[PDB]
Amino acid sequence: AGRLQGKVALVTGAGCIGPGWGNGRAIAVRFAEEGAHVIAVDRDLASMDATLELVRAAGGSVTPCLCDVTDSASVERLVADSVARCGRVDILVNNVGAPSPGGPVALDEAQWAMQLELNLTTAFLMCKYVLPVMEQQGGGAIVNIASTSGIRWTGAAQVGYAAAKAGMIQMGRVVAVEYAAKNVRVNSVVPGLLHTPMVDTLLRKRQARIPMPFMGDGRDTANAALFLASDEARFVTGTEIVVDGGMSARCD
Amino acid sequence: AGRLQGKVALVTGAGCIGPGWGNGRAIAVRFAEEGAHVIAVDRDLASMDATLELVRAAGGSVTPCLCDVTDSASVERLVADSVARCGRVDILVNNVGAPSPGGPVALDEAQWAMQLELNLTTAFLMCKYVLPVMEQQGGGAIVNIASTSGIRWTGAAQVGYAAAKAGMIQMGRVVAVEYAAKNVRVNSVVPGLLHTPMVDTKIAHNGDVELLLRKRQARIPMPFMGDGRDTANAALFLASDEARFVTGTEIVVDGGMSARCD
Amino acid sequence: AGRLQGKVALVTGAGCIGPGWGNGRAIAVRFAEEGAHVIAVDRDLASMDATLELVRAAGGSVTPCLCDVTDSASVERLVADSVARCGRVDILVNNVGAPSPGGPVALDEAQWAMQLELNLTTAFLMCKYVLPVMEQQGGGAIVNIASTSGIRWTGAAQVGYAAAKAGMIQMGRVVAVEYAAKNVRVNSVVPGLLHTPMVDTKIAHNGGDVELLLRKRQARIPMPFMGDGRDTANAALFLASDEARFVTGTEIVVDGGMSARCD
Amino acid sequence: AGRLQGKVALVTGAGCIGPGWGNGRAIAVRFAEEGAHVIAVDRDLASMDATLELVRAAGGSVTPCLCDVTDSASVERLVADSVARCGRVDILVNNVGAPSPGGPVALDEAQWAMQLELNLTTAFLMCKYVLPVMEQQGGGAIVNIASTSGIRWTGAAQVGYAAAKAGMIQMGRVVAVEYAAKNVRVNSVVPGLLHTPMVDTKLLRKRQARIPMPFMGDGRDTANAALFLASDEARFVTGTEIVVDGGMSARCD
Ligand SMILES: [Mg+2]
Ligand SMILES: [Mg+2]
Ligand SMILES: [Mg+2]
Ligand SMILES: [Mg+2]
């Protein structure tokens, strides 16, 4: 019996631009290893082909779904299809997101809008349509994948990403309080500087910020998300797990 | 010599729907009392009439500007015109904002977009156009007026406001770090539950009002509820040279509310 | 293979005054279920009898030790003897602690001193003697069991406990940064209002109506139930395990949502 | 009318060893400039002489008191004498403190105990004896001078100081909640890496590189934040902190 045995987990941003342990891919793989049926969602189907192979070679259960989760009609259709095919959505992982460079002067206004939409509105829309399902079915768990950029300056200007990710963390807290009585838990993973395929489009420069003598990858995000999504976290809600090698604890 | 003597301060959301100490109005008056020339900005010109009267009764200097600070072309002109008329913009107070009720299910998606735009994009656009002025002139101070809704659930669902105000606090921190070398400081005031015209009008317009007022007061350890004057006094400290080494941080102005969860 | 297979875990405050899921007892049971050999430490054996019974009924491995972990000579001997018996100490759980009522006026100065000693100095001394073992052997994991009283006012005045638990959380962070290069991780669990034998017995043996107090405490928790030591233990298990290899200098709050609200 | 006009402010650690703006010297001077009568307290009486002359050259009101505020009997007498002479204690600034180097292995157990006593028990004892006075008189304001070492690793191991200062910050928050109904406010200043005489005596380049702003503050920065928090302009501010650190704690690059 896996730690998510029999659960249905909807994971956004489950594809990856290249080989390696991206957050979404690692979450899909780890959750399927623990017995969840994974609904793997991405705006590009081909980016999930490698994710599906990893899950299925290990005997896990995963279904790919094409969706633009910035579009509310598409999200509504995705959630309805998930309920139609799987009966329940027990777990939602809001993982879609990506940074764009620049502070308020350099960051173009259109890119600022895209950054808020991709990193924050997506999670809002997924919650809008998944929360009624979780309420009706007796409960559920939501895990937001945020970033240390939402709590610190970590090296680079990226003001839309920083603001959106801070908004994502706080949205998690206030949704947690509002829906706790319906047995819906909401928490965030706050990953730091990880070696993911998106990061690969210097590593010593990022490593110098990390007290631990290595750099994590999507598997580290996935293991924290696994705890928060599981019944072993039944009394954990409205909070975060920072996964950053100690970086945000220091300012030397 | 006042604590802001000779400074030019641009304050958004400086009007109110009615009489009383709104945050923007109180900031405009308090800053003018301390010798700043205030550029008072609002989307409604008449809503600043009372602000102008209070400033001038205090012997202060204020100029009203009609502007929709969600519109970048309008913001760019506002800043260029302020520099042309005043030479400098020493202080920017990002105060425009307003909440709308509802969590992710109840809050209409168009209202979510409006909430992010009004509470967060406005501050981004003001920073976009004021930061080059502050950099060129040798420095400046930015004060964001956020909310305890950005750090806690304080009683009501208002998810766009909560997310936007948390975004505003963090935007302040990252802009502070990026621009510190240019002598630009950025900090937030985090007001809790206050008596301001916009908050009190909404409550009066609507369940059991007596019970709501009591529940709100019960969240505050101090024996009273503050108002815009409290926000203004914290903003004054952060905008002043007495805070020359304070940047990237917040002052919570909430009567002790966020320190408790009993 | 359990999630702590082959690890040696030293857990302080592993006994309880009565039956039920105290934090230390639950940690000992859960860690042993995941394959750790548990060195279960408390002031007296009788409080650990039930802990040992539950560990062993679950097929786990546990050795009881008696120690006053406020006494550095005793701690030094406990660690040296543990290394002699087990070769290593892979995991340290600093769990001993207890609150005493009162703010700065009401709390006696002697009780303030005892509160800092019991809740904070114990963790400092365990780290003093365990860190060299972890450094020499190539790494380790430390989990401090703190309290929401270290981050919020949660209903009751207990200023020594609040200050000590905040100190414990921050000590964890600074030890994490200092020892990260030696592959030692340090994190805290921050439990909220739970059903543990110590908490429940104090409430039951105390001073207005008990049911009124229980309901007042539950009203602070957004979730529709109150957790127990098993919730603390599951968070500690994650933080002690290799699945948290990149997690250090931080906390997991286990409180049903309480500290996220101030309504 | 100064910002503390007519207030009585008891400031611990008001002495200073060496030239420059230490926190205690700067707090005493700034508060007296704003019209407070300052009760300047230190364990070394001579260390306050320059503080007194700076205040008095400006026409301000200050009285020195020799006291070891780790000793509760001495604190009790200090507070009673202050009420007898001044009628009220409106403001308490807990500024005594100092770090000692080392993490849990290196820091001697006796030094750990001294660190908790100096940085945390002192503030507890001052609150124990000042709070009843503030409650009886209708209110008051307490300002704790903590440190960024209570919220971050800032460069050096000093585990007793870090733990004690985190304890001081949280003690302030819980005392704020407990005593708010009595109109007593409690807040902390959280100073970062400052140029103080204490720092200069018992490097500046490494510290400066951690600070986003292009200079390093001193005790005057601590004093200005404490002045705000002690003043009636902060009437609705309680249970919180002002970090005075040039932006350092906002970054981890
Ligand atoms: Mg570095
Ligand atoms: Mg208003
Ligand atoms: Mg117990
Ligand atoms: Mg309540």
Short mmCIF file of C-alpha atoms in Angstrom, two decimals, chain B residues 5-261:
data_model
loop_
_atom_site.label_atom_id
_atom_site.label_comp_id
_atom_site.label_asym_id
_atom_site.label_seq_id
_atom_site.Cartn_x
_atom_site.Cartn_y
_atom_site.Cartn_z
CA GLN B 5 10.84 69.27 4.78
CA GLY B 6 11.22 70.15 1.11
CA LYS B 7 10.38 66.68 -0.18
CA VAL B 8 7.91 65.99 -2.99
CA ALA B 9 5.61 63.05 -2.22
CA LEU B 10 3.27 61.43 -4.76
CA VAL B 11 0.37 59.64 -3.01
CA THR B 12 -2.14 57.48 -4.88
CA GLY B 13 -5.69 56.85 -3.69
CA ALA B 14 -5.66 60.22 -1.92
CA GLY B 15 -9.45 60.74 -2.05
CA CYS B 16 -12.29 59.08 -0.12
CA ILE B 17 -15.95 58.34 -0.81
CA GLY B 18 -16.87 60.36 2.27
CA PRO B 19 -15.55 62.17 5.34
CA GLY B 20 -13.07 60.54 7.69
CA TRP B 21 -9.48 59.36 7.86
CA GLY B 22 -8.92 57.15 4.88
CA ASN B 23 -5.35 55.97 4.45
CA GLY B 24 -4.54 58.12 1.42
CA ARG B 25 -6.15 61.25 2.85
CA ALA B 26 -4.40 60.81 6.20
CA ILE B 27 -1.06 60.25 4.46
CA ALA B 28 -1.52 63.38 2.33
CA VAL B 29 -2.37 65.51 5.37
CA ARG B 30 0.34 64.10 7.64
CA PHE B 31 3.03 64.39 4.98
CA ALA B 32 2.03 67.98 4.20
CA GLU B 33 2.16 68.79 7.93
CA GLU B 34 5.79 67.63 7.89
CA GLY B 35 6.73 69.95 5.05
CA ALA B 36 6.34 67.77 1.98
CA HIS B 37 4.68 69.02 -1.15
CA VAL B 38 2.05 66.38 -1.83
CA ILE B 39 0.94 65.34 -5.31
CA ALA B 40 -2.43 63.79 -4.40
CA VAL B 41 -3.67 61.35 -7.04
CA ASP B 42 -7.09 59.74 -7.38
CA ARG B 43 -9.34 58.34 -10.09
CA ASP B 44 -12.09 60.71 -8.86
CA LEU B 45 -11.23 64.40 -8.52
CA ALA B 46 -14.08 65.44 -6.21
CA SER B 47 -13.16 62.72 -3.69
CA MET B 48 -10.00 64.74 -2.98
CA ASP B 49 -11.83 68.01 -2.20
CA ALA B 50 -11.90 67.15 1.51
CA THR B 51 -8.26 66.07 1.39
CA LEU B 52 -7.28 69.45 -0.10
CA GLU B 53 -9.28 71.32 2.54
CA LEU B 54 -7.57 69.45 5.40
CA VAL B 55 -4.08 70.06 3.96
CA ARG B 56 -4.69 73.75 3.43
CA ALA B 57 -6.22 74.16 6.89
CA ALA B 58 -2.90 72.77 8.17
CA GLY B 59 -0.91 75.28 6.09
CA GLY B 60 0.42 72.58 3.77
CA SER B 61 1.10 72.30 0.04
CA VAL B 62 -0.87 69.87 -2.14
CA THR B 63 -1.75 69.52 -5.84
CA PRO B 64 -4.65 67.28 -6.93
CA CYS B 65 -4.14 65.10 -10.01
CA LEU B 66 -6.87 63.08 -11.70
CA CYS B 67 -5.38 59.81 -12.91
CA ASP B 68 -6.32 56.18 -13.49
CA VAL B 69 -3.11 54.53 -12.28
CA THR B 70 -4.11 51.21 -13.82
CA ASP B 71 -3.34 52.83 -17.21
CA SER B 72 0.38 52.89 -17.98
CA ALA B 73 0.16 55.77 -20.48
CA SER B 74 -1.64 57.82 -17.83
CA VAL B 75 0.96 56.91 -15.18
CA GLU B 76 3.83 57.84 -17.48
CA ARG B 77 2.27 61.26 -18.12
CA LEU B 78 1.50 61.74 -14.41
CA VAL B 79 5.15 61.13 -13.51
CA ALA B 80 6.55 63.24 -16.35
CA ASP B 81 4.24 66.12 -15.44
CA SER B 82 5.15 65.83 -11.75
CA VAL B 83 8.86 66.02 -12.58
CA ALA B 84 8.27 68.97 -14.91
CA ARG B 85 6.33 70.86 -12.24
CA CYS B 86 8.22 69.81 -9.08
CA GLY B 87 11.72 68.86 -10.29
CA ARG B 88 11.83 65.73 -8.16
CA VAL B 89 9.65 62.94 -6.86
CA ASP B 90 11.34 62.13 -3.57
CA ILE B 91 8.63 59.86 -2.12
CA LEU B 92 6.07 57.55 -3.71
CA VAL B 93 3.22 56.13 -1.62
CA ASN B 94 1.41 53.28 -3.40
CA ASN B 95 -1.91 53.47 -1.57
CA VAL B 96 -4.67 52.89 -4.15
CA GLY B 97 -6.39 49.55 -3.60
CA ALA B 98 -9.66 48.04 -2.47
CA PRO B 99 -10.95 44.56 -1.56
CA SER B 100 -13.76 42.57 -3.14
CA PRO B 101 -15.43 39.68 -1.32
CA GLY B 102 -15.09 36.00 -2.14
CA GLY B 103 -12.78 32.98 -2.26
CA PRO B 104 -11.82 31.14 -5.45
CA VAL B 105 -15.29 29.69 -6.02
CA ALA B 106 -17.36 32.82 -5.32
CA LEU B 107 -15.04 35.50 -6.75
CA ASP B 108 -15.83 36.03 -10.44
CA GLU B 109 -12.76 35.65 -12.65
CA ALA B 110 -13.19 39.17 -14.03
CA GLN B 111 -13.24 40.52 -10.47
CA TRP B 112 -10.11 38.51 -9.65
CA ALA B 113 -8.41 40.23 -12.60
CA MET B 114 -9.63 43.64 -11.41
CA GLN B 115 -8.39 42.87 -7.88
CA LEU B 116 -4.88 42.06 -9.07
CA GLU B 117 -4.89 45.12 -11.33
CA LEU B 118 -6.11 47.60 -8.72
CA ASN B 119 -4.10 46.34 -5.77
CA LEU B 120 -0.87 45.13 -7.37
CA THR B 121 -0.45 46.27 -10.99
CA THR B 122 -1.01 49.89 -9.93
CA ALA B 123 2.02 49.70 -7.63
CA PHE B 124 4.06 47.96 -10.33
CA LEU B 125 3.27 50.73 -12.85
CA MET B 126 4.00 53.53 -10.38
CA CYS B 127 7.36 51.89 -9.63
CA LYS B 128 8.06 51.38 -13.36
CA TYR B 129 7.84 55.12 -14.02
CA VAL B 130 9.03 56.59 -10.71
CA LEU B 131 12.13 54.40 -10.22
CA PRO B 132 14.06 55.99 -13.13
CA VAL B 133 13.33 59.44 -11.66
CA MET B 134 14.55 58.39 -8.20
CA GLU B 135 17.64 56.73 -9.65
CA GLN B 136 18.55 59.81 -11.71
CA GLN B 137 18.01 62.30 -8.88
CA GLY B 138 20.14 60.38 -6.37
CA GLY B 139 17.59 58.39 -4.41
CA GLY B 140 14.09 58.21 -3.02
CA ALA B 141 11.70 56.35 -0.78
CA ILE B 142 8.75 54.16 -1.76
CA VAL B 143 6.06 53.15 0.76
CA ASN B 144 3.54 50.48 -0.24
CA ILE B 145 0.26 50.42 1.71
CA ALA B 146 -0.55 46.70 1.86
CA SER B 147 -2.92 44.91 4.33
CA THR B 148 -2.94 42.22 6.99
CA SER B 149 -5.00 40.32 4.40
CA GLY B 150 -1.65 39.71 2.71
CA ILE B 151 -0.29 37.81 5.73
CA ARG B 152 -3.31 36.22 7.49
CA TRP B 153 -6.92 35.20 7.16
CA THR B 154 -8.46 38.05 9.16
CA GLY B 155 -12.14 37.12 8.99
CA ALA B 156 -13.48 37.35 5.46
CA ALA B 157 -12.84 35.64 2.15
CA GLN B 158 -11.33 38.03 -0.39
CA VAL B 159 -8.81 35.95 -2.26
CA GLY B 160 -7.82 38.45 -4.97
CA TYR B 161 -7.11 41.07 -2.33
CA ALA B 162 -5.14 38.65 -0.14
CA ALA B 163 -3.04 37.42 -3.05
CA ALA B 164 -2.50 40.92 -4.46
CA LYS B 165 -1.48 42.41 -1.12
CA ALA B 166 0.98 39.57 -0.47
CA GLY B 167 2.35 40.20 -3.93
CA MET B 168 2.65 43.90 -3.08
CA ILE B 169 4.65 43.20 0.09
CA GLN B 170 7.04 40.90 -1.74
CA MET B 171 7.36 43.25 -4.71
CA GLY B 172 8.50 45.86 -2.21
CA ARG B 173 11.18 43.55 -0.82
CA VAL B 174 12.64 42.58 -4.19
CA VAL B 175 12.56 46.14 -5.54
CA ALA B 176 14.26 47.26 -2.31
CA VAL B 177 17.13 44.85 -2.86
CA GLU B 178 17.45 45.64 -6.57
CA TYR B 179 17.50 49.44 -6.09
CA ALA B 180 19.27 49.80 -2.74
CA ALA B 181 22.57 50.59 -4.47
CA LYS B 182 20.81 53.56 -6.13
CA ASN B 183 19.76 54.89 -2.70
CA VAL B 184 16.08 53.98 -3.23
CA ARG B 185 14.39 52.50 -0.19
CA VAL B 186 11.18 50.46 -0.40
CA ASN B 187 9.02 49.36 2.54
CA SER B 188 5.40 48.45 3.23
CA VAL B 189 2.89 49.47 5.83
CA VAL B 190 0.66 46.51 6.67
CA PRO B 191 -2.56 47.96 8.16
CA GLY B 192 -5.03 45.69 9.93
CA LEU B 193 -8.70 46.41 10.59
CA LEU B 194 -9.24 50.18 10.51
CA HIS B 195 -12.00 52.74 10.49
CA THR B 196 -11.63 54.22 7.02
CA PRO B 197 -14.49 55.62 4.92
CA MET B 198 -14.34 52.81 2.37
CA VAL B 199 -14.33 50.07 5.02
CA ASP B 200 -16.96 51.66 7.25
CA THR B 201 -19.28 52.55 4.36
CA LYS B 202 -19.33 48.98 3.07
CA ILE B 203 -20.12 47.66 6.56
CA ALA B 204 -22.94 50.16 7.08
CA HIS B 205 -24.45 49.45 3.65
CA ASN B 206 -25.03 45.82 4.69
CA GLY B 207 -26.21 39.96 8.28
CA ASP B 208 -25.97 41.30 11.83
CA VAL B 209 -23.95 44.53 11.72
CA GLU B 210 -23.68 44.74 15.51
CA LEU B 211 -22.28 41.21 15.59
CA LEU B 212 -19.84 41.90 12.74
CA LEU B 213 -18.57 45.06 14.46
CA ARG B 214 -18.09 43.13 17.71
CA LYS B 215 -16.32 40.18 16.03
CA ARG B 216 -13.98 42.55 14.23
CA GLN B 217 -13.17 44.44 17.42
CA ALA B 218 -12.58 41.17 19.31
CA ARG B 219 -9.70 40.35 16.94
CA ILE B 220 -7.78 43.44 18.12
CA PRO B 221 -5.97 43.14 21.48
CA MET B 222 -5.70 46.93 21.87
CA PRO B 223 -8.80 48.65 23.32
CA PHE B 224 -9.65 50.59 20.15
CA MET B 225 -9.59 50.36 16.36
CA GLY B 226 -7.24 52.67 14.49
CA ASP B 227 -7.79 54.65 11.31
CA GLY B 228 -5.86 56.26 8.45
CA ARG B 229 -3.86 58.39 10.90
CA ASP B 230 -2.16 55.24 12.13
CA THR B 231 -1.24 54.13 8.62
CA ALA B 232 -0.04 57.66 7.89
CA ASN B 233 2.24 57.85 10.93
CA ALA B 234 3.94 54.58 9.99
CA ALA B 235 4.25 55.70 6.36
CA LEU B 236 5.77 58.98 7.56
CA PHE B 237 8.51 57.16 9.47
CA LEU B 238 9.29 54.92 6.49
CA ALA B 239 9.28 57.84 4.00
CA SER B 240 11.58 59.99 6.17
CA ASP B 241 15.35 60.24 6.43
CA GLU B 242 15.07 58.88 9.98
CA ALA B 243 14.51 55.53 8.23
CA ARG B 244 17.64 55.90 6.04
CA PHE B 245 18.79 52.34 6.94
CA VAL B 246 15.31 50.73 6.77
CA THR B 247 14.50 48.99 3.51
CA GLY B 248 12.95 45.79 2.26
CA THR B 249 10.70 45.39 5.31
CA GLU B 250 7.28 46.13 6.79
CA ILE B 251 5.55 47.87 9.68
CA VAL B 252 2.38 46.07 10.75
CA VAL B 253 -0.23 48.53 12.09
CA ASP B 254 -2.95 46.30 13.50
CA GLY B 255 -3.40 46.70 17.28
CA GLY B 256 -1.72 43.34 17.85
CA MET B 257 -4.15 41.29 15.73
CA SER B 258 -1.69 39.26 13.67
CA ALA B 259 0.34 38.25 16.76
CA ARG B 260 -2.56 36.15 18.08
CA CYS B 261 -4.54 33.13 16.95
#
